[PDB]
Amino acid sequence: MHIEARLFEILTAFFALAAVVYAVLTAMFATGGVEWAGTTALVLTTGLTLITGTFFRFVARRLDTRPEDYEDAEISDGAGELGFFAPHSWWPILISLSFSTAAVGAALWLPWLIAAGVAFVITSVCGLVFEYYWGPEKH
Amino acid sequence: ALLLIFLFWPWEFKAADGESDFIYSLTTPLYGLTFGLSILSIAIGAVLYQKRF
Amino acid sequence: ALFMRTELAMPGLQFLSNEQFNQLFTMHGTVMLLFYATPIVFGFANLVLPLQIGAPDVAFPRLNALSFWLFLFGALIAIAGFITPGGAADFGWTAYSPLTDAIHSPGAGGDLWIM
Amino acid sequence: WSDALALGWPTGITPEAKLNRELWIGSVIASFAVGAIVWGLIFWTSAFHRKKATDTELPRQFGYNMPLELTLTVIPFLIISVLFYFTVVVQERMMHKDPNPEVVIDVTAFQWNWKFGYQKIAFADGSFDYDGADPERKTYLNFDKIETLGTSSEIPVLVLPAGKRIEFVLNSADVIHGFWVPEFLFKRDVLPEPKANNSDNVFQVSEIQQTGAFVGRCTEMCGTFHAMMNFEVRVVEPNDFKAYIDQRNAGKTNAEALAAINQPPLAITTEPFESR
Amino acid sequence: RIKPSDLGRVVKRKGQESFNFGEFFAFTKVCSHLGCPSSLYEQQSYRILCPCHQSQFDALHFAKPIFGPAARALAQLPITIDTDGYLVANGDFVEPVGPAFWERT
Amino acid sequence: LFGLAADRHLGAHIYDPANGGVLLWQHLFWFFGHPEVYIIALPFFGIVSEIFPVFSRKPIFGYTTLIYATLAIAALSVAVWAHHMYATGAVLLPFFSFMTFLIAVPTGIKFFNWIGTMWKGQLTFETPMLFSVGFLITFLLGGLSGVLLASPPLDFHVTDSYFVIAHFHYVLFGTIVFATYAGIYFWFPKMTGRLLDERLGKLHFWLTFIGFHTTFLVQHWLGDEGMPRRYADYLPTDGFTTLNVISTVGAFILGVSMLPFVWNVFKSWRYGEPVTVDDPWGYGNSLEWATSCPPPRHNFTELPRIRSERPAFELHYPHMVERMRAEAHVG
Amino acid sequence: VLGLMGGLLQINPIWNLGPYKPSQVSAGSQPDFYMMWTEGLARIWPPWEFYFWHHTIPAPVWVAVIMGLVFVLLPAYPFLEKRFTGDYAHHNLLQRPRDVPVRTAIGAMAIAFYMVLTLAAMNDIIALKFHISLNATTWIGRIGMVILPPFVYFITYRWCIGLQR
Amino acid sequence: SSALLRTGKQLFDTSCVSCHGANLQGVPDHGPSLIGVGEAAVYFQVSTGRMPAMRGEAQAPRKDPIFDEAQIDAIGAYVQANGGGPTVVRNPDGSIATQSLRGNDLGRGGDLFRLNCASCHNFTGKGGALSSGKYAPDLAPANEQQILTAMLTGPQNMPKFSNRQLSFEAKKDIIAYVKVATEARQPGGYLLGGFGPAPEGMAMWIIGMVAAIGLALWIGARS
Ligand code: HEA
Ligand code: HEA
Ligand SMILES: CC(C)=CCC/C(C)=C/CC/C(C)=C\CC/C(C)=C/CC/C(C)=C/CC/C(C)=C/CC/C(C)=C/CC/C(C)=C/CC/C(C)=C/CC1=C(C)C(=O)c2ccccc2C1=O
Ligand code: HEC
Ligand code: HEC
Ligand code: FES
Ligand SMILES: [Cu+2]
Ligand SMILES: [Cu+2]
């Protein structure tokens, strides 16, 4: 993919420019020196876009043309078998209930509720991860 | 371990605020922890034997 | 918002209080900005993005339902401060710096708000 | 004619207020012109091109007009550059802070009322010099000798001369409050510890032309009784101010010190709140 | 002991107008629903709370119940002082104390 | 928020005014909070830009220009966060003032592209087009008031007053409410197979428009003269007691304006003229109007050949590609 | 399991309490969880008494008859169901709960009623730990006792038919 | 330097006059008079943090204190100079006292606690719920002088125990019982919060029954 990488490179360039400009303009002309709270956010949003753009760049350099990236193409090119898309599942609502229990146990300071919520989150996430890998029962 | 704990552990009531015992407060938890865990291990071994042999 | 307006007409405190008015504008701002707009964005997205790009489904189909249920239960948690005898959160929508401390604003509605 | 184009801005009682009002009027007229142009465009294209008339094949499939887009992306840059320059000029002017003031007030805002200080009086006339600082502070707050303190039953009235440099030093005891006098066309936040937070809590007023009484509000979120922190500002003549000060130096309340110079003792723009 | 400030919000049930000695009232402590001690006394709402099932009686209105399955008022005891300055009882309850039964309260 | 909860439940000395705790919270919160308003603003720009060509019978004016304007707004939205903290006297004013003045431009090019797409077409005003035009008007007024608000010496007076409330209510309402109603009236058939009523839609639109413009217009004047936000009471000796009455009348009109919409949705979901075709709004685009009106599970039974950004239009009108490619650059 | 949880968790610490005396009381006065429904029913039942000639019928009589009615309706259910459905045949194969929607809905309604009665017994603990008014919890129980069972019935019926589909 | 309550009436004027008045007169909207009260009331109300209070409702909760560095003494002396309320106990150094008020007798202290105090709080000093909002807090984090001044001044909706109906030995013994009951072990395992059978039933249903049903699912087949 060539255009996504270019988008992220544009964003990273602008963010780095803005971060450096803000840092050096608040080093002077400011009440107490460098501002130290917007500077950090700016360098690390630069780092975010940089990470994403670099990953996309490597994947693009390690890839041959794709029917999506390619113009000139027809629908007989993508004829094949896509991945695995999960049909019906009921684990998400249980995960959300467990996380909400832990959150309300953290709002009102109740340690037992926090412990129960964490245990339920571990259980529900385990159920979600193993859903399509449990084998038949051994009897 | 249950037998040894029951025989040789300080069990008498010692509570006060001068000599914080903390050894007496662990006397019943140890009884339970040894007894229940021993019999649970026996049960699990039996279930495994039935399931695999 | 209608409660707020009907109090703001006719100078004098006719039927509300100061605490109740503060809670009203706080919860109005919070609900209208975070429990109606940000999720309606993803509502329209889930409706018509895969159709527009010509795809059969979204990338991760169970993360979708997880997101919806998280939204719903977080909203219900934050709103359920009105059944507390002290009321909901009473600072602004923006929760300025020392007013949301433990000394000022000591109720149990701010905790539910945050979580 | 200008009371309408000001959209209800009160006329100033300070030179910088009048500069601010001039800038406001100019910018309002500019934005109104832009809005009128664009609304005319919309009403036109919806009133005449609406004619999906008796006959139709399909109108035309045109989508790119490069020179027009370049023109309409280059003009707004200039239109904003002009006003950016003007606003920089005016906001630089309104925050001058000349070194030597003539009256220095210490404004303290605590939970739902005010307290004013009278830190120093030094006329450029050589007519009146006074110092009210106090080591009563046995630590960022300022304590003084002549302190008009407001309570829930009396609106604190601040008295100032007319035609002198005034300086306000803003400090808060608990939380953030707001210091707004709608006639100064200016406001500033009253922070708890303004120096540890890198905010300058000092602003000056060049002169106050008109005399009278003016109301002030809080413009922050203080808590329950935020809407009940009003105060008043009485601007009197320099000699009347000197009489007020020297009669206050002899132990006397604000009400009697105000009555002794033939002025109403209580605030005339604001009344205490029954619904508190 | 009722604060002298209020002493004007008392209602004084029809048969017991003189059962109090100044600011002392001396109600019973056995809840009139099932007999738990109604000992939770809130000093500035003047409410007595039974902790077993949460009834509420109004100490300023002859201990009239104002919440819950409780339906009958608490019994009041007449008090006075003797020739030496000690608190004594000035008689007996006008009615049975405690839960109700088939015969009467 | 985790820092705040730690400070509330453990006494964590994170936001004390003794440290830089008062401005730290404001910096963090507003660095979050301005991207939030742009997050809830952009997709509705998309919605209206997607509704306009269907009812104008024209292509979208300046495709790549709109894409670049979107990217520019996105990039600029994170470096203006401190124009909400003018009155604290603790920020570098020229930087943020200039950069908000800068972010004012791409929205202008977007607006001009919309007006150009409506220019010299064949307009028909069904409910989505009507709501989109309302969006245009309201957002223009709100953005004008905002760019007026962006200068520091004026924000020195109108900040924390009802002028700000009127401003962000104009932008918020005009964007979310109007574009959302447009999207609902537009994509109701594609998700249901029925058609919403149109007389009820027009009644709904006019009620909403009148009530809104009568509840929020006088608040500019109401806040220019001193009346700050977040007051529960005021005195009769003060002015502004008639403007509050006008505003509350408008608020009640806005409140009553919601009955036609919910009645229309409640009736038209079960009854209501069915749709037995693709593309009930003829001259559609975007590949969603090329599948059955209630789409099947997995959304597609066949795809068309894709050559431009209007594939459904070229599918339903094959005698038009020569004219779409020939005269696509006159302007 | 019983040995483990009898060694590691504490139950009924009678020494923290005192000997029984008719003059003193505490705040948590609940019974074990199998009588909590009886206590909750006594808490949320309104004060309806009858006074006629020389006599008195107090409120807990209501608790008595409701308790007895429950204990009489439990053992007599199979005969009620066979009278109502009219099916008298021998059966040795069980039913899945999704194939009998009406009985499943009845059972879910009864379980919801029992849960409401049990939660109405820990009013003090709930109102103290979770910051809610006490009168609020009393009225919540008093109204839930009427509106929760039918809601649960409706949802359970629709859910069973959804599973069948 | 006891002739110095100029501090005192320096903090009151900037933190209290909006709700009690400039002369400690009880603004008829929010606050009480504060004239008959003494140093003990101010100490208990400020040291626990319930003072200077925001909006104010059914119960002002406990918060973090604002004042120390001997300014609780300043406000206390300033308020005592305008009335004759009770005063805080002091040790031979002038500071506020402690472990000498531990009623060497815990039997009498516990009987007095169960008769007078346990009705609202608990058997062992946990919380208890009152009517319409208000509750009775937990007795764990309060120190000795706070317990004494609490039962001496009678804070909001809590009865007032004078020194004539509850002598000083009685108070010391109650303090000792409270401080011992909040700091003793549980010699039977993990106590489930201090309350009765509700946490016990919950722990049964959510530990023992899930263990039993999980082992039943593991052992027996499903069909
Ligand atoms: C959903 C949206 C939303 C949007 C889109 C905006 C858009 C803008 N906002 Fe607004 N704003 C808010 C929501 C929004 N805002 C909220 C919620 C608050 C405060 C909330 C809080 O404090 O509690 C707020 C507050 C706020 C403030 C500070 C108020 C304060 O003092 O407290 C400022 C100015 O600094 C501001 C500025 C702008 C600017 C410059 C734009 C610009 O994006 C708009 C530019 C738009 C135009 C329409 C221009 C039209 C273009 C043409 C026609 C070309 C015209 C050219 C010239 C005139 C040059 N906003
Ligand atoms: C996306 C957002 C959004 C929307 C839609 C609105 C909608 C409205 N807002 Fe709000 N508003 C904000 C965001 C929004 N607001 C924000 C951010 C603030 C300031 C935040 C703060 O200060 O902290 C604010 C503050 C604010 C104030 C001032 C508060 C203060 O004093 O400072 C006012 C009133 O003057 C107001 C009014 C309205 C009105 C009249 C509407 C009308 O649009 C709404 C009309 C709506 C209806 C009436 C619903 C119809 C209801 C019925 C039919 C009742 C039926 C009931 C049942 C079935 C349950 N808003
Ligand atoms: C199913 C049956 C009840 C139908 C009977 C048919 C009916 C028509 C006969 C008439 C009955 C009358 C008319 C109404 C009945 C209502 C009530 C008054 C009956 C009294 C006794 C009654 C018969 C007992 C039945 C109650 C019922 C069967 C309980 C079973 C619950 C289910 C099946 C457990 C499954 C697994 C379980 C959920 C593991 C998770 C743990 C959860 C949290 C359990 C919930 C929970 C429970 C259940 C507590 O009891 C409890 C007590 C104290 C503190 C906390 C809890 C608690 O959290
Ligand atoms: C109006 C907000 C408010 C502020 C600010 C405030 N108080 Fe209070 N105060 C109250 C209220 C309301 C009560 C009634 C007690 C209650 O109901 O909890 C009270 C009660 C008291 C009491 C106990 C009265 C009694 O009869 O026992 C004292 C002592 C006291 N305040 C002192 C102070 C001190 C010291 C300060 C810190 C300078 C302060 N107040 C600030 C509202 C306030
Ligand atoms: C139900 C009536 C009631 C009685 C009886 C009662 N309390 Fe209180 N107690 C309360 C209430 C209500 C408060 C909260 C007062 C406040 O927050 O201002 C309280 C507060 C306290 C506090 C402060 C707790 C803290 O953490 O700050 C202590 C200590 C205390 N009481 C001790 C006692 C003692 C000892 C007794 C027995 C002599 C007793 N109480 C009897 C209701 C009561
Ligand atoms: S025993 Fe007092 S309420 Fe039932
Ligand atoms: Cu204020
Ligand atoms: Cu601001």
Which amino acid is located at A114 in the chain? I
Nearest to F328 among D61, D91, D178 (CB): D61
Q: Whose CA is nearest to atom 42 of ligand 5?
A: H158
Considering only CA atoms, which of D198, A20, C103 is closest in space to residue F24?
A: D198
Q: State the residue range of the domain holding F140.
A: 1-327
Q: Which 3 state secondary structure label does DSSP give F282? A: coil
Query: What is the DSSP annotation of F179-230?
Result: HHHHHHHHHHHHHHSB---SHHHHHHHHHHHHHHHHHSSTHHHHHHTT-BSS
Q: What residues of chain H, 173 to 192, have a C-beta less than 8 Å from chain G? A: 181, 186, 188-192
Q: Is F254 close to ligand 2, i.e. is its CB under 6 Å away?
A: yes
Q: Return the residue whose CA atom lies nearest to atom 37 of ligand 1.
A: F146
H128 contact residues in E (CB cutoff 8 A): 40, 51
Residue E71 region by backbone torsions, left for phi larger than 0, else alpha for psi between -120 and 50, else beta? alpha
d(CA D28, CA D22): 10
Query: Does H60 sit in the ligand 4 pocket, CB within 6 Å?
Result: yes
Kindly state the helix (H) or strand (E) to which residue G83 belongs, with its residue range. helix G77-85
H46 Cα to chain D: minimum distance (Å): 16
Instruction: Measure the CA–CA gap between D86 and D78, rounded to whole angstroms.
Output: 13
> How far is residue D143's CA from residue A132's CA, in Å, rounded to a whole number?
73
Mark the breaks in chain G: residue after which each occurs, C to N over 2.5 Å.
none
User: HSE on the CB side for F309, CA within 13 Å?
Assistant: 10
Is the CB of residue F162 less than 8 Å from the CB of residue F219? yes
Contacts of G69 (CB under 8 A, 6+ apart): none
How far is F321 from F311, CA to CA, in rounded Å? 10
Q: Is F47 left (phi over 0), alpha (psi -120 to 50) or beta?
A: alpha
**Is E31 assigned to a binding site?**
yes
Give the neighbours of chain C: at least 3 Cβ pairs within 8 Å: A, D, F, G, H
Q: What angle do CA F113, F118, F121 make, to 5 degrees?
A: 140
Per DSSP (E only), the strands in C44-88 are none
Is H30 assigned a ligand-binding role in the annotation? no
Say if residues F41 and D215 touch (Cβ distance below 8 Å): no
Q: How far is CA D168 from CA D102, D165, D177, in A?
A: 11, 10, 15
Contact C17, H29 (CB under 8 A): no
Residue nearest atom 15 in ligand 4 by C-alpha distance: H156
* Per-position b or e across D209-229, b if 16+ CB within 10 A of its CB: eeeeebbbbbbbbbbbbbbbb
Q: Does D169 touch chain F (CB under 8 A)?
A: no
Q: How far is the CA of F277 from the centre of ligand 6 (A)?
A: 70
Distance from CA of H51 to the nearest CA of C (A): 10
What residue owns the CA closest to ligand 5's atom 37? H117
Is ligand 5 within 6 A of the CB of residue H117? yes
Please report, as a single letter, which amino acid is at residue C16: L
Q: How far apart are CA G72 and CA E82, in angstroms?
A: 59
Pocket test for ligand 6, best of E27, E48, E52 (most atoms within 8 A of CB): E52
Cα torsion angle, F170, F175, F179, F180, sign: negative
Smallest CA-to-CA distance from H153 within H89, H110, H217 is with H89
Chain centroid, CA F224 distance in Å: 25
Report the amino acid identity of residue G29.
S
Do E9 and E32 touch, CB atoms closer than 8 A?
no
- Per CB-CB distance under 8 Å, the chain C contacts of H55 are 18-19, 90
- Taking the C-alpha atoms of residue F33 and residue D142, their distance in angstroms, rounded to an integer, is 35
- Phi-psi sector, D135: left (phi>0), alpha (psi -120 to 50), beta: alpha
Q: Select from B1, E73, F165 the least CA-distant residue to G47.
A: E73
- The amino acid at D235: V
> In Å, how far are B13, B29, G34, G164, H197 from G63, measured between CA atoms?
45, 41, 16, 40, 22
How far is residue G117 CA from its own chain's centroid?
4
Answer whether H37's CB lies under 8 Å from H152's CB.
no
Integer-rounded Cα Rg, in Å, for chain D is 26
**How far does the CA of residue G19 sit from the closest CA of chain B (Å)?**
20
Resolution for the entry shown, Å: 2.9
Tokens of E3: 């604060």
**Chain D residues with CB-CB distance to A31 below 8 A:** 198-200
Q: Pick A104's closest partner by Cβ from C63, C72, C77.
A: C77
Q: How far is the CA of E58 from the centre of ligand 6 (A)?
A: 15
Q: Compute the nearest-CA separation of F58 from chain D (Å).
A: 6
CA distances (Å), origin B53, targets A135, B45, B48, F108, H215: 21, 12, 8, 79, 19
Q: Which residue has the tokens 């806040």?
A: F223
Q: Min CA distance, H211 vs chain E (Å)?
A: 34
Asked if B39 lies within 8 A of G8 by C-beta distance, the reply is no
What technique solved it?
Answer: cryo-EM
Tell me how far the alpha carbon of residue F87 lies from the centroid of ligand 7, in angstroms: 15
DSSP assigned state of D226: G
**Six-digit token string for G45:** 């039942």
Report which of A81, F75, D226, A96 is spatially closest to residue C18, judged by C-alpha positions: D226
Q: CA nearest H88: which of H143, H133, H21?
A: H143
Unique residue bearing structure tokens 């201090």: H194
Nearest by CB: D175 against C22, C90, C104: C104
CA distance D66 to chain A (A): 23
Tokens of B46: 């039996």
**Cα F90 → chain centroid:** 32
Cβ atoms B6, B35 nearer than 8 A: no
* Any H CB within 8 A of D253 CB: no
By C-alpha distance, which of D142, D141, D95, D103 is closest to D122? D103
Burial of B37 (0-12, 13-18, 19+ CB in 10 A): middle
Count of CA atoms in the C-beta half-sphere (13 A) of F199:
1
Rounded Cα distance between D183 and D20, Å, is: 12
The DSSP annotation for F66-97 comes to HHHHHHHHHHHTTS-GGGG-STTS-S-HHHHH
- The dihedrals phi and psi of D115, each to the nearest 5 degrees, come to -160, 120
Report how far residue F54's alpha carbon sits from residue F183's, in angstroms, rounded to the nearest whole number.
Answer: 13
- Residue D214 CB contacts under 8 Å (≥ 6 apart), including other chains: D13, D181, D182, D183, D232, D233, D235, D269
For G89-100, b/e burial (b = at least 16 CB within 10 A) is eeeeeeeeeeee
Q: Are strands H135-136 and H128-129 parallel, antiparallel or unpaired?
A: antiparallel
Contact C95/D221 with Cβ under 8 angstroms? Answer: no
How many whole angstroms separate alpha carbon H67 and alpha carbon H22?
19
As beta bridge partners, residue D168 has D105, D203
CB atoms within 10 A of CB D246: 12
Q: Where are the alpha helices (H) located in chain H, listed in sequence order? A: 12-15, 17-20, 39-47, 71-80, 106-112, 144-153, 168-181, 197-203, 209-219
**Euclidean distance between CA atoms C62 and C24, whole angstroms:** 36
| D138–H14 C-beta distance less than 8 A | no
- The 8-class DSSP code of residue E48 comes to E
For residue A13, the chain F residue with the least C-alpha distance is: F75
DSSP H111: H
Partner C contacted by D202 (CB < 8 A): no
CA-closest candidate to residue D105, choices D241, D247, D271: D241
Contact D234, C27 (CB under 8 A): no
Assess A109–H contact: CB distance below 8 Å, yes or no: no
**Distance separating alpha carbons of residues F237 and F218, to the nearest angstrom:** 20
Among residues H50, H45, H131, H112, the alpha carbon closest in space to that of E42 is found at H131
How many interface pairs between D and H have CB atoms less than 8 angstroms apart?
43
Chain breaks in chain F (C to N over 2.5 A) after: none
Residues H101 and H88 sit within 8 Å (Cβ to Cβ): no
The structure tokens listed for D194 are: 């303004």
- Both tokens of C43, joined, read 């509502």
What 8-state DSSP symbol labels residue H36? Answer: S
**Atom 17 in ligand 3: residue holding the nearest Cα:** G114
| CA neighbor of G41 nearest in space, from G58, G62, G56 | G62
**CA–CA gap between residue G55 and residue F69 (Å, rounded):** 88
- CATH no. for residue F192? 1.20.210.10
State the ligand closest to the CA atom of F227: 2
Query: Which residues on neighbouring strands pair with residue D215, listed in sequence order?
Result: D232
A-chain residues near G129 (CB < 8 A): 108, 110
Phi, psi of F45, rounded to the nearest 5 degrees: -50, -45
Q: Residue for token digits 């060694």?
A: G7
Angle between helices F127-149 and D15-47 (to 10 degrees): 160
User: Which of A107, H20, F305, F329 is closest to D67 using CA atoms?
Assistant: F329
**Tokens 């307290």 label which residue?**
D115
Ligand number with the minimum distance to the CA of H83:
4
**What is the longest distance spanned by two Cα atoms in chain H?**
88
Contact C83, C107 (CB under 8 A): no
Residue of H131, H152, H164 for testing the chain E interface, max E β-carbons within 10 Å: H131
Q: For residue H140, give every residue at least 6 positions away whose Cβ sits within 8 Å of its Cβ, in sequence order, or none.
A: H125, H182
- The secondary structure element, H or E, covering residue D231 is strand D231-236
E61 labeled binding residue: no
Helices C61-79 and C18-34: angle between axes, nearest 10 degrees: 170
Closest CA to G111 of G142, G77, G148, G79: G148
- Nearest Cα residue to atom 19 of ligand 1: F168
Ligand 2 mutation target, pool F38, F135, F139, F165, most atoms within 8 A of CB = F165
Ordered DSSP codes for chain A: --HHHHHHHHHHHHHHHHHHHHHHHHHSSSSSS--SSHHHHHHHHHHHHHHHHHHHHHHHHT----TTT-SS--TTSS-S----------HHHHHHHHHHHHHHHHHTT-HHHHHHHHHHHHHHHHHHHTTTT------
> CA nearest F137: which of D45, D51, D30?
D45
| Interface contact A137-H221, CB threshold 8 A | yes
Q: How many domains does chain F have?
A: 1
Tell how strand D231-236 and strand D157-161 pair up: parallel
Q: Of E13, E10, E11, E26, nearest to E81 (Cα)?
A: E26
Q: Helix, strand or coil for residue D111? A: coil
Q: How far apart are CA G36 and CA G30, in angstroms?
A: 7
User: Which region, left, alpha or beta, applies to residue H193 given φ > 0 means left and ψ of -120 to 50 means alpha?
Assistant: left
φ, ψ for residue F236, nearest 5 deg: -70, -25
**Amino acid code (one letter) for D105:** I
Q: For residue C26, how far is the Cα from the chain centroid?
A: 9
What residues have CB less than 8 Å from D276, skipping those under 6 apart?
Answer: D152, D225, D228, H27, H29, H30
Question: What span, in angstroms and rounded, lies between the C-alpha atoms of C44 and C53?
Answer: 14
Distance CA G108, CA D102 (A): 82
- The Cα G71–Cα G67 span in angstroms is 6
Do chains G and E touch, with touching meaning 3 or more CB–CB pairs less than 8 Å apart?
Answer: yes
Nearest ligand, measured from the Cα of H18: 4
Report the alpha-carbon distance of residue D241 to residue H203 in Å, rounded: 76
Q: Which residue out of H14, H30, H66, H73 would a mutagenesis test of the D interface target, given it has the greatest number of D Cβ atoms within 10 Å? A: H14
Contact residues of ligand 1, CB 6 A cut-off:
C 93-94; D 31, 34, 38, 76, 79-80; F 37, 40-41, 83-84, 100, 103-104, 107-108, 111, 140, 143, 146-147, 149-150, 155, 159, 164, 168, 171-172, 175
Q: Which of D178, D15, D87, D219 is nearest to F152 (CA)?
A: D87
Q: Which residues of A touch H221 (CB under 8 A)?
A: 137, 139
Q: Is C106 on the interface with H (CB under 8 A)?
A: yes
Torsion over CA of D48, D53, D56 and D62, rounded to 10 degrees?
Answer: 10
User: Is H115 within any annotated ligand binding site?
Assistant: no
